[PDB]
Amino acid sequence: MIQRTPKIQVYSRHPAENGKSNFLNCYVSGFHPSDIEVDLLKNGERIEKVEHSDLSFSKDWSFYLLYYTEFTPTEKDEYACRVNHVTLSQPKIVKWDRDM
């Protein structure tokens, strides 16, 4: 069977400013098949209040999903996205880097 690996991006909707509410996004694209596990993490722990887009796909048939939550960034809090998929031999964690 065809398998395509998710391309994972973790980022804020707006430029991050400490103390200002924003949205944390994890966008996963380019993957096949559609079964995927995606979690947003705060200080290594799973965020419960997480929504996602309806499953859709690109021209090349590969799937994409946006996972997101409202958040207020601080100095100390670390955010990440954890993704598991048949193409990944273990879960992949991508850290939010606000200085890109």
Partner 1 sequence: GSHSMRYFFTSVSRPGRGEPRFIAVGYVDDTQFVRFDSDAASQRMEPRAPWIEQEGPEYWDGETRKVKAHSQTHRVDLGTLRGYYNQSEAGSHTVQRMYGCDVGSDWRFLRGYHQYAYDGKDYIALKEDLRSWTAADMAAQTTKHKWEAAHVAEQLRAYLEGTCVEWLRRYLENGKETLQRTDAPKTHMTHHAVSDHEATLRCWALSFYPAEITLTWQRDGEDQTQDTELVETRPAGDGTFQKWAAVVVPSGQEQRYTCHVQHEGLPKPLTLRWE
Q: Does 63 bind partner 1 (CB under 8 A)?
A: yes
Report the residue number, 37 or 44, with the smaller CB distance to partner 1.
37
Give the Cα separation of 55 and 6 in Å (integer).
Answer: 14
Q: Which stretch binds partner 1 (CB under 8 A): 37-45, 62-70, 73-81, 88-96?
A: 62-70
Query: In whole angstroms, what is the distance from residue 74 CA to residue 19 CA?
Result: 6
Return the range that interacts with partner 1 (CB under 8 A); candidates 7-15, 37-45, 71-79, 88-96: 7-15
Q: Which of 18, 20, 21, 35 is in the footprint of partner 1 by CB under 8 A?
A: 35
Least distance to partner 1 from the beta carbon of 14, Å? 8
**Per-residue tokens: 92:** 């992949």
Contact 91, 84 (CB under 8 A): yes
My answer on whether omega of the bond before 15 falls inside 30° of 0, hence cis, is: no
Query: Residue 97 is encoded by which pair of tokens?
Result: 């880097």
From candidates 19, 74, 75, 100, binder to partner 1 by CB under 8 A: 100
